[PDB]
Amino acid sequence: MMYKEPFGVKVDFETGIIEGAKKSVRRLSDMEGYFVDERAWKELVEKEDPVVYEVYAVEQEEKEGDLNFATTVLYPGKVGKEFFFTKGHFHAKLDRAEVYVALKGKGGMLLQTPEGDAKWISMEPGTVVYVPPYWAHRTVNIGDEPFIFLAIYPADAGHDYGTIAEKGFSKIVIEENGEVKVVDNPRW
Amino acid sequence: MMYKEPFGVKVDFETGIIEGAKKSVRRLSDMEGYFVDERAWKELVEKEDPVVYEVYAVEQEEKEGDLNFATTVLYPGKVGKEFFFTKGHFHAKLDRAEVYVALKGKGGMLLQTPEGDAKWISMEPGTVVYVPPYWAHRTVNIGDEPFIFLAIYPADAGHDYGTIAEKGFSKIVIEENGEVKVVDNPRW
Ligand SMILES: O=C(NO)[C@@H](O)[C@H](O)[C@H](O)COP(=O)(O)O
Ligand SMILES: O=C(NO)[C@@H](O)[C@H](O)[C@H](O)COP(=O)(O)O
Ligand SMILES: [Zn+2]
Ligand SMILES: [Zn+2]
């Protein structure tokens, strides 16, 4: 039988750039219906339309046992009080776990179950996050520099964005009274 | 609707230590039949018996789609001309892939197919190695300081050490004339 070729790729923990990877870019305009403050979103899109995050994904065929890996560069910023975040998703195969290795910056992960059980995990360089089966996950940049991390996930996990896209997470991550706060989403 | 708890753990990139992890120690005396120079192995065991490597593992139950992670501290040394290495294994579920992230030191990975064809991947801090389905894998420390890396692998992958314990890899990594060389294993 044919065996796939092993490879190494150098990843600058300062940039998150992977050569040979599929690069995807999310601007604020790619994120309509995601942030609580809709008027703040609209204004920011018209003034700047900032890049919220970039992903460098090295992806295999959707086979059991195989592994994908991707870095994310999550840029600093706010939409009103709400910190820049990733869209967030469940996996297409719900019971697929994931491992995150925080590389640069200050951020965290919001995770929630299909029942809306909600978890916040602080992330700083060296933080490894176990994302268990069934937990949807969004990363958040709570600092003023790029938040960079590596994600390793089953090649057959898939990305399920729909239910998060309409309903969001049960918690939001805001700056209020000079504090980073994880509070109940009002639109939830 | 029981779900497992998400968590974050600090991995120290300088030392490899994961506080709370399952720590494993492998001494040279636990590696009979692994190095070409058996007399050199015997002597180094009788006089010192160094730790060759340590593993800090965060493991889940053996379920499909779940993920384990572990750091290895592979200490610097030689047995005769042959650099210290990990025992090396195939996965019990052969088609399970793996992703390594090099954190500190100077090393590399020896990989081989069930047919004994071998590959070498140099690893320096920042190197991410994709270990494809079906490839056995051994890491080697080619420098004078600890070689430290993080591995992420399917939780149902398992470890099979059998044929490697008997026959090793078809290639060896040695120092010869002040130079690191990947050469054919004379035993093969
Ligand atoms: O969790 C991952 N992979 O499965 C990550 O690689 C995410 O896919 C990545 O950070 C981008 O975020 P969204 O996919 O939520 O837009
Ligand atoms: O590949 C891994 N996990 O599957 C690694 O975590 C290895 O198990 C670890 O580096 C120790 O090497 P041996 O298992 O060959 O002694
Ligand atoms: Zn995911
Ligand atoms: Zn392995």
From Swiss-Prot, chains A, B:
This entry's Enzyme Commission designation comes to 5.3.1.9
Q: Which UniProt keywords apply?
A: Cytoplasm, Gluconeogenesis, Glycolysis, Iron, Isomerase, Metal-binding
Temperature dependence is: Optimum temperature is 90-96 degrees Celsius. Highly thermostable.
Query: How does its record describe regulation of its activity?
Result: Inhibited by mannose 6-phosphate, fructose 1-phosphate and fructose 1,6-bisphosphate.
Q: Which residues bind Fe cation?
A: H89, H91, E98, H137
Pathway annotation from the record: Carbohydrate degradation; glycolysis; D-glyceraldehyde 3-phosphate and glycerone phosphate from D-glucose: step 2/4
Pfam families membership: GPI
Superkingdom classification of source? Archaea
Reactions mediated catalytically:
alpha-D-glucose 6-phosphate = beta-D-fructose 6-phosphate
Would the keyword Cell inner membrane be found if you checked this record's keyword annotation?
no
- GO cellular-component terms in the record? cytoplasm
Q: Which compartments does it reside in?
A: Cytoplasm
Cofactor details (free text): Binds 1 Fe cation per subunit.
- The reply on keyword Iron is yes
Essential cofactor(s): Fe cation
Which CDD domains does this chain map to? Answer: cupin_PGI (cd02218)
- Which GO molecular-function terms appear in the entry? glucose-6-phosphate isomerase activity; iron ion binding
Recorded effect of pH on activity:
Optimum pH is 7.0.
Show the coiled coil region(s).
none
Give one GO biological process term.
gluconeogenesis
Q: How does it assemble?
A: Homodimer.
Family, as annotated: Belongs to the archaeal-type GPI family.
What is the protein name stated in its UniProt record? Glucose-6-phosphate isomerase
Query: Which species expresses this protein natively?
Result: Pyrococcus furiosus (strain ATCC 43587 / DSM 3638 / JCM 8422 / Vc1)
Q: What's the gene?
A: pgiA
